[PDB]
Amino acid sequence: TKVEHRCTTNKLSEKHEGSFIQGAEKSISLIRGGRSEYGAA
């Protein structure tokens, strides 16, 4: 008598995370008249 029994398996996992934040700010200002300390402020 002869007997054989066998099994095999393959498995995977993956995970990801990602983030991207982007920003722009601009300001433009003009003042005329006044005194330079407060006009500066």
Place this chain on the structure above:
Amino acid sequence: SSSRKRRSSSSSSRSYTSHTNEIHKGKSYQLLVVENTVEVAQFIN
């Protein structure tokens, strides 16, 4: 795997595993300020 023949017998097993991580970052900030003050807004020679 396992086997018997006739008495004689044998068995075997395995694991293989591989794993990987990567993390990456880039940050940039730029500022420009250009500011002018005039206090004697005109001298005319």
